[PDB]
Structures are given as C-alpha cells and as structure tokens.
Amino acid sequence: SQQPFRPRIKAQLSGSGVSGNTDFEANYDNLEILSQTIYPDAFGNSLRSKIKAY
Amino acid sequence: SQQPFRPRIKAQLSGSGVSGNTDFEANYDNLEILSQTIYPDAFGNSLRSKIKAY
Numbered sequence: 001s002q003q004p005f006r007p008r009i010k011a012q013l014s015g016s017g018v019s020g021n022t023d024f025e026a027n028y029d030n031l032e033i034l035s036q037t038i039y040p041d042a043f044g045n046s047l048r049s050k051i052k053a054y
Numbered sequence: 055s056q057q058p059f060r061p062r063i064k065a066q067l068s069g070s071g072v073s074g075n076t077d078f079e080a081n082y083d084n085l086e087i088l089s090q091t092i093y094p095d096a097f098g099n100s101l102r103s104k105i106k107a108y
Contacts, residue, residue, distance in 0.1 A: 002107075
C-alpha cells in the first residue's frame with residue numbers, strides 16, 4: 001500500500017545501569033528513536049511501435 | 055427513434071358566426087392548428103485521471 005515511508009533507528013544504549021542491589025529506577029536508560037521520511041517518485045518511459053504489417 | 059418532435063395544439067374557435075337566416079358560408083370559422091418543433095441537443099462532461107500509480 002505504497003505511501004511515503006518512514007524508517008526508524010534506535011540508538012545504542014550507552015548508560016551505566018545499576019550495580020548490586022540498586023534498583024533500576026536509580027538509572028533508567030533512555031531509548032532514543034531517529035526517523036526519516038521517504039517520499040515516492042513516479043517515473044517511466046514508453047516505446048511506440050510501427051504498423052502491425054511492418 | 056428520437057427525431058425532432060412536433061407537437062400541436064388546436065386553438066379555440068372565435069369569430070362571430072352567422073345569425074338568423076344568414077348561411078354558414080357568410081362567416082366560415084378557421085380551425086387553427088399551432089405547432090412547435092423541439093430539436094434535440096447533445097451535451098456531456100468528462101473527468102480524466104492521473105497516472106495509475108498516483
């Protein structure tokens with residue numbers, strides 16, 4: 001269902017987590033999503049033939 | 055077979071007529087027929103599309 005498409009990446013997690021008994025809320029890691037929009041493009045070409053006899 | 059059409063109406067009589075002993079030929083009435091001619095007319099409209107891809 002061809003539409004302008006939007007592919008997304010997620011960056012690498014690059015935080016220190018938690019050590020030992022510390023719970024996750026002391027260092028939550030941030031998921032980051034980057035995006036791009038790809039709009040379609042129509043293009044074509046045609047060939048016209050001669051008369052059937054030829 | 056939709057040809058040009060021609061309807062007709064019969065007009066209503068007027069005119070004095072004859073009185074007494076006067077004979078009919080002294081005032082003949084006119085049986086008047088009126089007609090109209092309706093000629094057909096062709097008319098139409100159109101919508102063109104963009105490329106199938108669009």
